Amino acid sequence: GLMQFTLPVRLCKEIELFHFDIGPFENMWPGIFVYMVHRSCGTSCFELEKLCRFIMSVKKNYRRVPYHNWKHAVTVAHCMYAILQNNHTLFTDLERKGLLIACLCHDLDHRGFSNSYLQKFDHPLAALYSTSTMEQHHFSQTVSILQLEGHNIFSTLSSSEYEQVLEIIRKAIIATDLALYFGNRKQLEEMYQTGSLNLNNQSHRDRVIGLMMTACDLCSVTKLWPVTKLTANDIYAEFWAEGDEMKKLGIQPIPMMDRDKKDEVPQGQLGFYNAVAIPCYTTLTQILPPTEPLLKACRDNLSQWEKVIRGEE
Ligand SMILES: O=c1ccn(-c2cccc(OC(F)(F)F)c2)nc1-c1ccnn1-c1ccnc2ccccc12
Ligand SMILES: [Cl-]
Ligand SMILES: [Mg+2]
Ligand SMILES: [Zn+2]
């Protein structure tokens, strides 16, 4: 109760910035997450012993894959922390509780394969859930862990408050299905432009949280260039493995996933920044002005990828 968490000076200052990198020391990541919960939510909202037990079981249920791993989980939670800390008064007690937990759990039990590969393999999860296949599985893993003995971090909520926070978490996790993002950002764009966007309309709040979840999930494109460039290597390691598994099924993979088309990656990143990342952080900055540093850092990285194409690096 009087047991605060403190980081070394450089981490204490840098963790407040959007472009923070959590570093290569795995054993510090739980303490970084508890620090962010205490400052973002309060020291009183979770029982420390239960929270620590929950974090360690979540960690155990992430796999040893190049990108969709425990480090990505904590990185996405830190970006949500930065957004919540820069938009202090906009979010309820329950949303702050649920959104950091949702980010930590959003890729639980990921094996580095897209919803597409699961459908073509005819994976059992694809029969259980036809759409947002991996995202419904991630939410299912979250409920499993929340139901282990001594793991109910929401124990002091009433049943109706418990049901609300699990519904925040479910929608937040489903929203990380990038297939759903395109329509979501389009609708938010229209609502914003015609001035109909209303943060008191729960169905409008849901869309904005959805867009926050996309922004946090993509946040590797908003780091300083050296971090962004090295993360791209881990992203494409997974893509190329899926490409190999497509060829085993007797299917030519899309060029993004083909390791023979490695030369096409720089122009591939241009496309992703122009089609996905720039619009995402552009629409998010319109709705939440203090997230502008995410758009700025994203543009800086787009400019770095153009230098790669032009042989300036
Ligand atoms: O660098 C990239 C290049 C291509 N794609 C990508 C991923 C899925 C679909 C896609 O096609 C389309 F846009 F048409 F939808 C493109 N994503 C990234 C990327 C940047 C940061 N995260 N991230 C992600 C990498 C891998 N999986 C992710 C899943 C969800 C969100 C983000 C993901
Ligand atoms: Cl605060
Ligand atoms: Mg995911
Ligand atoms: Zn993710």
List binding-site positions: 68, 72, 106-107, 217, 269
Under a CB-based contact definition with an 8 Å cutoff, are residues 19 and 224 in contact? yes
Ligand nearest to the CA of 67: 1
Residues 6+ apart with CB under 8 A from 74: 22, 29, 32, 33, 104
Please say whether the dihedral angle defined by the alpha carbons of residues 156, 153, 28 and 14, taken in this order, is positive or negative. negative
Under a CB-based contact definition with an 8 Å cutoff, are residues 212 and 83 in contact? yes
In b/e form, how buried is each residue of 232-247, taking b as 16+ CB within 10 angstroms? bebbbebbbbbbebbe
The candidate with the shortest Cα–Cα distance to 102, out of 145, 49, 66, is 145
Ligand nearest to the CA of 73: 4
Domain positions in the chain: 28-310
Look at the block and give the residue holding tokens 């997230």: 291
Look at the block and give the residue holding tokens 């042989």: 311
Side-chain half-sphere CA neighbours of 271 within 13 A: 7
Q: DSSP state, 24?
A: S
Under a CB-based contact definition with an 8 Å cutoff, are residues 68 and 107 in contact? yes
Look at the block and give the residue holding tokens 């297939």: 179
Query: Into which CATH architecture does domain 28-310 fall?
Result: Orthogonal Bundle (1.10)
**123 vs 70: CA distance, rounded Å:** 23
Whole-number CA gyration radius for the chain:
19
The candidate with the shortest Cα–Cα distance to 41, out of 167, 150, 170, 157, is 157
**178 vs 277: CA distance, rounded Å:** 11
Which tokens sit at 71? 């480090």
Which tokens sit at 188? 């938010």
Q: Which atom of ligand 1 is nearest to the CA of 238?
A: 26
Which tokens sit at 244? 């190999």
**273 vs 271: CA distance, rounded Å:** 6
Tell me the CA–centroid distance for residue 75 and ligand 4, in Å. 9
**220 vs 111: CA distance, rounded Å:** 19
Q: Could you please report the per-residue DSSP string of 66-86? A: SSSSHHHHHHHHHHHHHHHHH
Ligand nearest to the CA of 215: 1
Mutate to test the pocket of ligand 1, among 71, 177, 184, 235 (most ligand atoms within 8 A of CB): 235
User: φ and ψ at 223, to 5 degrees?
Assistant: -85, 170
What residue type is assigned to position 47 of the chain? Answer: E
Question: Which residue's alpha carbon is nearest to atom 6 within ligand 1?
Answer: 272
User: φ and ψ at 192, to 5 degrees?
Assistant: -70, -45
Tell me the CA–centroid distance for residue 114 and ligand 1, in Å. 10
Side-chain half-sphere CA neighbours of 241 within 13 A: 14
Under a CB-based contact definition with an 8 Å cutoff, are residues 72 and 29 in contact? no
Tell me the CA–centroid distance for residue 165 and ligand 2, in Å. 20
Terminal-to-terminal C-alpha distance of the chain: 51
Under a CB-based contact definition with an 8 Å cutoff, are residues 294 and 285 in contact? yes
Residues 6+ apart with CB under 8 A from 187: 207
Element (H, E) at 119: helix 115-121
Residues 6+ apart with CB under 8 A from 154: 97, 146, 161, 162, 165, 166
What residue type is assigned to position 230 of the chain? Answer: L
**6 vs 18: CA distance, rounded Å:** 19
Q: How far is CA 156 from the centre of its chain?
A: 27
Under a CB-based contact definition with an 8 Å cutoff, are residues 262 and 249 in contact? no
Q: In the structure, which protein residues have their CB atom closer than 6 angstroms to any atom of ligand 1?
A: 178, 217-218, 220-221, 235, 272, 275-276
Active site residue ranges: 68
Tell me the CA–centroid distance for residue 67 and ligand 4, in Å. 9
Q: DSSP state, 156?
A: T
**Structure determination technique employed:** X-ray
Q: Dmax of the chain from CA atoms?
A: 60
Decide: residue 139, CB within 10 A, 0-12 exposed, 13-18 middle, 19+ buried. buried
Element (H, E) at 12: helix 9-14
Q: Which atom of ligand 1 is nearest to the CA of 277?
A: 20
Q: In the chain, after which residues does the backbone break, taking C–N over 2.5 angstroms as a break?
A: none
The candidate with the shortest Cα–Cα distance to 274, out of 221, 232, 230, is 221
Å resolution of this model?
Answer: 2.0
